[PDB]
């Protein structure tokens, strides 16, 4: 009984919660990957005499 | 043929020597052919072998390391035979000349064929101790041996190698120093012959019986699991690895031209046997291959 | 959320027959192979059937031989049991049970007491 | 300078011997995942061989101067579907079940675990033991008329003594009858769809045996020669 | 009565699910369906460090990316030096069945734990000079499957009881436990500021988890099968779940709601653990089939496969500024990518 009233009571606050369009969503990771990716170097490998591992 | 020939000549040498002071072929090129191009088959097939074996980094074990010493051992047998028989055709075919007989004696007693017969026997008792190394390796394996790896490779390798040495040196230092005619090729002495003939033959009788054993641990393991069919492909792969078919005549004109094509045929041949069914129609062989060519394929 | 819901089940009496449907939804249905679990008042979860991803393949517990027969539409994503000949031995709740990973001949803990991709349950009583 | 790198060279040399040393004694010894169920009695085969929150128990012994090395699994959940996993490498899985269990039946449930176990991916290769345990309490169940094996199983009936059987001296027949009809249940989902990978090991064991020891190293001794004998193909 | 409850539960079930719809206005297929592609992605293995003799389940990264701790099934933790391949440290453990391991952000500790319940916490930078159990934290009643560190003092252990714990290393007892899970968890990945994380379990289903309010936030659903890796997006709004399905999924917190499946038809075996890359483009994502593949996050279409590992792939660690990736493998191999 304790259970489901724990369940019930966390669905309750789990419905209340501010969800924003997926567009917004999408749009903040893109501009996250191309804004960060700049020095990524798995993405751009970076010149073969800084990498600690040749 | 031409052995004779100057055997004869020396006698005659020796009898004129004594009178001044005391006294007042087809089937010969036909089996060169066979054992040549068997043994050029080993050298390539085996060649190619140690370069698979050895370059893969997941077949690196205690089998794999002790199949690429047989491997190897193989190679420099089929390799001293080549030196031997090119060494020989070249001696006989410059220096044939009735005026020129003393060039081959010249070349006959140098110390150049006592080495060369030495690197032969070692080749040989080398060979024919790898083969028996395979096998005690393989009754530990079913035999609870189950040890330390320093203290089984290391004398796995010593058996193979130095062994062959420490009783063909015995031989060299007695036939240097007693009989020393003909570089070493006849044997003057039978005692000299056996004291490097019977640790082979021994060697032998060893793998023999390690072939028996495993015959019977391998019925033991079919009995309780066709059945005959099984058991006989295995005693035909298990053949050539452990060279049990040399209990056919080594425990031994008439035989003498099947008793040559035969031995010769077999062993020329051993070496792609023992290539063929530990290094290529293997599985683990097989799907390494296959496994590198679909992370080839990916471009 | 995966979903699996079962129906068809009541009180009958011995010697008829029952016709029980299991809707699934969230998943690929011809992936997993599905199971009939059912437990007794009394004792613990007990494993009846099985059928395989194809539905080629098909298992029973002794108890029942000979009686239940089982199919699964993949079409209609549902799986099936048919009861002939009860008993009043076969009084229990029925849960339709999954497979934990697809593609798998046979997989492990599906009548544990903590199961997760199972159903509520049919009463049946007879 | 290379006075560092050599002290870390130095440390790596000896980590590296430690870690070889450590080898050495790894791979001599054999470790065995012992399974089962609460009623099937494994905890009275743990205890007699005991003589050379927590979620596993161990137990060591030697038989014939090999260490055996084996794992039985306490404190944990219902699912074992996960944890399962990490005993891929094993030499053995024993798998005790209780042989009179039946009279609810609790029987098929041990068939459908060794069903599992048997066709699970990553134990496709490690061979099963398979203990037969309470051959005792199967004796008077079966020597009682309140038996009826037939209804759990409709095909003892049908099922007639094989004649590869060696019963023991004065067993009765319709005992022996019985209890072959259980082993090759095991042995109808053994032989079905195993290939020749892995295999099993039926054995009419007891808790007042002492053979168990002797039972698991023969056994173990029989599993590492055929995984020799495959890799030389000589099988 | 129960049943009661059970159709309001139901009801608030469908209720979120029509409130998850309605705000799900667009794919994100079609807005990144002309965006620039990344091309294929090749890596060749620059290290490749032996020693573990049984197989591996953990793998860690220091937080100088030159450090990795890796555990292995015989009972053995080894501090590798990934630069120069030289072990650090050698440590046996009690227990020679460990699932995780773990590297404290200081880099002083390290932790163990499997199938014994118990986690074990290793200081390496002892006064004498040697490596010993600082302590272990029992009390768990399932096989520990993770370990995180929050820092030096703080570390969270998820079990197979369906249960998280939060604990103490100098109480060495529980401050807190997360429940809920109705399965066993798997993997959970702290977030980058470490104020929250994710759990996954093996009914299917994520949580967000806040660590110090001590209670669930959000559930996230989707799944058809058990959750075997979590891993959080750099910037920590998002996370891939990668399950015994063959398909990974990426969540976003605030929506709440699924935003792009990377699956294939011809995958068919399950992820074993996930990761991202420093900068959140590139998603590395070991498999059954005996080798790791790589994904862009956005395109969601395969850049690059990490063959040469002739065993299941098990742990999978990428630096924290990205610049080498480590996998190790049942055949008791870790490989250096780069």
Same mark, same amino acid.
């Given at each position: 009984?304790?259970?489901?009233?724990?369940?019930?009571?966390?669905?309750?606050?789990?419905?209340?919660?501010?969800?924003?369009?997926?567009?917004?969503?999408?749009?903040?990771?893109?501009?996250?990957?191309?804004?960060?990716?700049?020095?990524?170097?798995?993405?751009?490998?970076?010149?073969?005499?800084?990498?600690?591992?040749? | 043929?031409? @052995?004779?020939?100057?055997?004869?000549?020396?006698?005659?040498?020796?009898?004129?020597?004594?009178?001044?002071?005391?006294?007042?072929?087809?089937?010969?090129?036909?089996?060169?052919?066979?054992?040549?191009?068997?043994?050029?088959?080993?050298?390539?097939?085996?060649?190619?072998?140690?370069?698979?074996?050895?370059?893969?980094?997941?077949?690196?074990?205690?089998?794999?390391?002790?199949?690429?010493?047989?491997?190897?051992?193989?190679?420099?047998?089929?390799?001293?035979?080549?030196?031997?028989?090119?060494?020989?055709?070249?001696?006989?075919?410059?220096?044939?000349?009735?005026?020129?007989?003393?060039?081959?004696?010249?070349?006959?007693?140098?110390?150049?064929?006592?080495?060369?017969?030495?690197?032969?026997?070692?080749?040989?008792?080398?060979?024919?101790?790898?083969?028996?190394?395979?096998?005690?390796?393989?009754?530990?394996?079913?035999?609870?041996?189950?040890?330390?790896?320093?203290?089984?490779?290391?004398?796995?390798?010593?058996?193979? @190698?130095?062994?062959?040495?420490?009783?063909?040196?015995?031989?060299?230092?007695?036939?240097?120093?007693?009989?020393?005619?003909?570089?070493?090729?006849?044997?003057?002495?039978?005692?000299?012959?056996?004291?490097?003939?019977?640790?082979?033959?021994?060697?032998?009788?060893?793998?023999?019986?390690?072939?028996?054993?495993?015959?019977?641990?391998?019925?033991?393991?079919?009995?309780?699991?066709?059945?005959?069919?099984?058991?006989?492909?295995?005693?035909?792969?298990?053949?050539?690895?452990?060279?049990?078919?040399?209990?056919?005549?080594?425990?031994?004109?008439?035989?003498?031209?099947?008793?040559?094509?035969?031995?010769?045929?077999?062993?020329?041949?051993?070496?792609?046997?023992?290539?063929?069914?530990?290094?290529?129609?293997?599985?683990?062989?097989?799907?390494?291959?296959?496994?590198?060519?679909?992370? @080839?394929?990916?471009? | 959320?995966?979903?699996?819901?079962?129906?068809?089940?009541?009180?009958?009496?011995?010697?008829?027959?029952?016709?029980?449907?299991?809707?699934?939804?969230?998943?690929?249905?011809?992936?997993?192979?599905?199971?009939? =679990?059912?437990?007794?008042?009394?004792?613990?979860?007990?494993? =009846?059937?099985?059928?395989?991803?194809?539905?080629?393949?098909?298992?029973?517990?002794?108890?029942?031989?000979?009686?239940?027969?089982?199919?699964?539409?993949?079409?209609?994503?549902?799986?099936?049991?048919?009861?002939?000949?009860?008993?009043?031995?076969?009084?229990?709740?029925?849960?339709?049970?999954?497979?934990?990973?697809?593609?798998?001949?046979?997989?492990?803990?599906?009548?544990?007491?903590?199961?997760?991709?199972?159903?509520?349950?049919?009463? =049946?009583?007879? | 300078?290379?006075?560092?790198?050599?002290?870390?060279?130095?440390?790596?040399?000896?980590?590296?011997?430690?870690?070889?040393?450590?080898?050495?004694?790894?791979?001599? %010894?054999?470790?065995?995942?012992?399974?089962?169920?609460?009623? *099937?009695?494994?905890?009275?085969? +743990?205890?007699?061989?005991?003589?050379?929150? *927590?979620?596993? #128990?161990?137990?060591? #012994?030697?038989?014939?101067? +090999?260490?055996?090395?084996?794992?039985?699994?306490?404190?944990?959940?219902?699912?074992?579907?996960?944890?399962?996993?990490?005993?891929?490498?094993?030499?053995?899985?024993? #798998?005790? +079940?209780?042989? *009179?269990?039946?009279?609810?039946?609790?029987?098929?449930?041990?068939?459908?675990?060794?069903?599992?176990?048997?066709?699970?991916?990553?134990?496709?290769?490690?061979?099963?033991?398979?203990?037969?345990?309470?051959?005792?309490?199967?004796?008077?169940?079966?020597?009682?008329?309140?038996?009826?094996?037939?209804?759990?199983?409709?095909? #003892?009936?049908?099922?007639?003594?094989?004649?590869?059987?060696?019963?023991?001296?004065?067993?009765?027949?319709?005992?022996?009858?019985?209890?072959?009809?259980?082993?090759?249940?095991?042995?109808?989902? *053994?032989?079905?769809?195993?290939?020749?990978?892995?295999?099993?090991?039926?054995?009419?064991?007891?808790? +007042?045996? %002492?053979?168990?020891?002797?039972?698991?190293?023969?056994?173990?001794?029989?599993?590492?020669?055929?995984?020799?004998?495959?890799?030389?193909?000589?099988? | 009565?129960?049943?009661?409850?059970?159709?309001?539960?139901?009801?608030?079930?469908?209720?979120?699910?029509?409130?998850?719809?309605?705000?799900?206005?667009?794919?994100?297929?079609?807005?990144?369906?002309?965006?620039?592609?990344?091309?294929?992605?090749?890596?060749?293995?620059?290290?490749?460090?032996?020693?573990?003799?049984?197989?591996?389940?953990?793998?860690?990264?220091?937080?100088?990316?030159?450090?990795?701790?890796?555990?292995?099934?015989?009972?053995?933790?080894?501090?590798?030096?990934?630069?120069?391949?030289?072990?650090?440290?050698?440590?046996?453990?009690?227990?020679?069945?460990?699932?995780?391991?773990?590297?404290?952000?200081?880099?002083?500790?390290?932790?163990?734990?499997?199938?014994?319940?118990?986690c074990?916490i290793?200081?390496?930078?002892?006064?004498?000079?040697?490596?010993?159990?600082?302590?272990?934290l029992?009390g768990?009643?399932?096989?520990?499957?993770?370990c995180?560190?929050?820092?030096?003092n703080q570390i969270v252990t998820?079990?197979?009881?369906?249960?998280?714990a939060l604990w103490d290393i100098?109480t060495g007892q529980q401050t807190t436990?997360?429940?809920?899970?109705?399965?066993?968890?798997?993997?959970?990945?702290?977030?980058?500021?470490?104020?929250?994380?994710?759990?996954?379990?093996?009914?299917?289903?994520?949580?967000?988890?806040?660590?110090?309010?001590?209670?669930?936030?959000?559930?996230?659903?989707?799944?058809?099968?058990?959750?075997?890796?979590?891993?959080?997006?750099?910037?920590?709004?998002?996370?891939?779940?990668?399950?015994?399905?063959?398909?990974?999924?990426?969540?976003?917190?605030?929506?709440?709601?699924?935003?792009?499946?990377?699956?294939?038809?011809?995958?068919?075996?399950?992820?074993?653990?996930?990761?991202?890359?420093?900068?959140?483009?590139?998603?590395?994502?070991?498999?059954?089939?005996?080798?790791?593949?790589?994904?862009?996050?956005?395109?969601?279409?395969?850049?690059?496969?990490?063959?040469?590992?002739?065993?299941?792939?098990?742990?999978?660690?990428?630096?924290?500024?990205?610049?080498?990736?480590?996998?190790?493998?049942?055949?008791?191999?870790?490989?250096?990518?780069?």
């Open positions: 009984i304790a259970q489901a009233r724990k369940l019930v009571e966390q669905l309750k606050m789990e419905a209340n919660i501010d969800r924003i369009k997926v567009s917004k969503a999408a749009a903040d990771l893109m501009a996250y990957c191309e804004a960060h990716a700049k020095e990524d170097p798995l993405l751009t490998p970076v010149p073969a005499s800084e990498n600690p591992f040749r | 043929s031409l @052995w004779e020939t100057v055997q004869k000549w020396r006698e005659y040498r020796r009898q004129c020597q004594r009178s001044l002071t005391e006294d007042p072929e087809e089937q010969l090129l036909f089996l060169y052919i066979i054992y040549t191009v068997g043994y050029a088959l080993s050298f390539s097939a085996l060649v190619i072998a140690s370069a698979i074996l050895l370059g893969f980094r997941h077949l690196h074990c205690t089998r794999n390391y002790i199949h690429l010493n047989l491997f190897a051992s193989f190679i420099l047998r089929a390799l001293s035979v080549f030196i031997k028989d090119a060494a020989l055709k070249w001696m006989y075919s410059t220096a044939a000349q009735q005026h020129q007989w003393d060039g081959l004696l010249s070349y006959q007693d140098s110390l150049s064929c006592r080495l060369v017969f030495l690197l032969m026997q070692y080749c040989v008792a080398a060979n024919y101790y790898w083969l028996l190394v395979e096998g005690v390796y393989l009754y530990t394996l079913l035999a609870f041996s189950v040890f330390s790896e320093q203290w089984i490779f290391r004398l796995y390798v010593s058996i193979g @190698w130095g062994v062959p040495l420490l009783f063909v040196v015995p031989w060299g230092i007695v036939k240097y120093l007693y009989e020393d005619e003909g570089c070493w090729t006849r044997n003057s002495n039978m005692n000299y012959w056996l004291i490097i003939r019977l640790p082979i033959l021994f060697a032998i009788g060893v793998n023999f019986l390690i072939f028996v054993r495993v015959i019977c641990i391998v019925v033991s393991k079919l009995k309780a699991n066709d059945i005959k069919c099984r058991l006989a492909k295995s005693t035909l792969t298990l053949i050539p690895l452990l060279g049990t078919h040399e209990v056919i005549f080594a425990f031994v004109g008439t035989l003498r031209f099947i008793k040559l094509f035969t031995e010769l045929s077999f062993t020329s041949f051993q070496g792609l046997m023992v290539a063929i069914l530990y290094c290529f129609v293997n599985n683990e062989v097989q799907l390494e291959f296959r496994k590198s060519w679909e992370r @080839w394929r990916l471009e | 959320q995966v979903q699996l819901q079962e129906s068809g089940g009541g009180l009958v009496q011995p010697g008829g027959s029952l016709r029980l449907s299991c809707a699934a939804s969230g998943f690929t249905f011809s992936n997993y192979k599905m199971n009939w =679990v059912r437990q007794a008042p009394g004792k613990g979860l007990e494993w =009846v059937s099985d059928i395989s991803q194809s539905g080629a393949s098909i298992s029973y517990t002794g108890s029942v031989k000979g009686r239940f027969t089982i199919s699964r539409d993949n079409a209609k994503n549902t799986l099936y049991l048919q009861m002939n000949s009860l008993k009043p031995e076969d009084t229990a709740v029925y849960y339709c049970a999954r497979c934990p990973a697809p593609f798998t001949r046979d997989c492990f803990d599906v009548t544990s007491t903590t199961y997760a991709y199972r159903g509520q349950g049919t009463q =049946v009583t007879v | 300078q290379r006075n560092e790198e050599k002290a870390q060279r130095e440390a790596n040399k000896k980590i590296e011997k430690q870690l070889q040393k450590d080898k050495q004694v790894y791979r001599a %010894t054999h470790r065995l995942l012992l399974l089962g169920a609460g009623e *099937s009695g494994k905890n009275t085969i +743990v205890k007699q061989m005991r003589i050379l929150t *927590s979620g596993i #128990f161990e137990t060591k #012994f030697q038989v014939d101067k +090999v260490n055996f090395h084996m794992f039985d699994v306490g404190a944990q959940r219902d699912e074992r579907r996960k944890w399962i996993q990490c005993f891929n490498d094993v030499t053995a899985i024993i #798998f005790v +079940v209780a042989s *009179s269990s039946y009279n609810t039946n609790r029987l098929q449930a041990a068939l459908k675990l060794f069903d599992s176990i048997w066709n699970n991916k990553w134990l496709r290769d490690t061979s099963v033991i398979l203990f037969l345990n309470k051959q005792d309490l199967l004796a008077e169940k079966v020597l009682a008329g309140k038996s009826k094996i037939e209804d759990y199983f409709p095909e #003892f009936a049908r099922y007639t003594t094989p004649e590869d059987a060696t019963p023991e001296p004065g067993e009765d027949p319709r005992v022996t009858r019985a209890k072959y009809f259980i082993r090759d249940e095991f042995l109808r989902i *053994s032989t079905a769809s195993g290939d020749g990978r892995h295999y099993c090991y039926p054995h009419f064991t007891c808790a +007042v045996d %002492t053979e168990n020891i002797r039972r698991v190293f023969n056994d173990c001794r029989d599993i590492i020669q055929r995984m020799h004998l495959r890799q030389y193909e000589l099988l | 009565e129960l049943d009661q409850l059970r159709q309001e539960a139901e009801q608030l079930k469908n209720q979120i699910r029509d409130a998850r719809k309605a705000c799900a206005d667009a794919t994100l297929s079609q807005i990144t369906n002309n965006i620039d592609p990344v091309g294929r992605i090749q890596m060749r293995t620059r290290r490749t460090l032996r020693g573990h003799l049984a197989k591996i389940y953990a793998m860690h990264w220091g937080t100088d990316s030159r450090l990795l701790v890796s555990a292995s099934q015989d009972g053995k933790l080894i501090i590798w030096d990934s630069y120069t391949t030289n072990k650090v440290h050698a440590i046996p453990l009690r227990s020679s069945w460990v699932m995780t391991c773990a590297y404290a952000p200081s880099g002083n500790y390290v932790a163990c734990g499997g199938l014994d319940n118990i074990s290793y200081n390496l930078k002892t006064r004498e000079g040697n490596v010993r159990v600082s302590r272990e029992a768990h009643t399932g096989y520990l499957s993770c995180r560190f929050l820092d030096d998820s079990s197979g009881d369906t249960t998280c100098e436990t997360f429940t809920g899970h109705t399965g066993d968890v798997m993997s959970l990945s702290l977030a980058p500021d470490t104020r929250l994380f994710v759990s996954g379990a093996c009914d299917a289903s994520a949580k967000l988890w806040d660590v110090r309010e001590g209670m669930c936030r959000q559930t996230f659903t989707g799944h058809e099968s058990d959750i075997n890796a979590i891993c959080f997006f750099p910037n920590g709004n998002a996370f891939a779940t990668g399950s015994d399905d063959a398909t990974c999924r990426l969540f976003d917190l605030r929506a709440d709601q699924e935003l792009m499946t990377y699956s294939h038809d011809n995958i068919i075996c399950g992820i074993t653990s996930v990761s991202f890359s420093k900068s959140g483009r590139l998603l590395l994502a070991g498999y059954d089939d005996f080798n790791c593949n790589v994904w862009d996050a956005l395109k969601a279409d395969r850049a690059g496969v990490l063959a040469g590992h002739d065993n299941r792939v098990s742990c999978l660690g990428v630096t924290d500024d990205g610049m080498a990736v480590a996998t190790g493998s049942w055949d008791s191999f870790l490989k250096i990518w780069n």
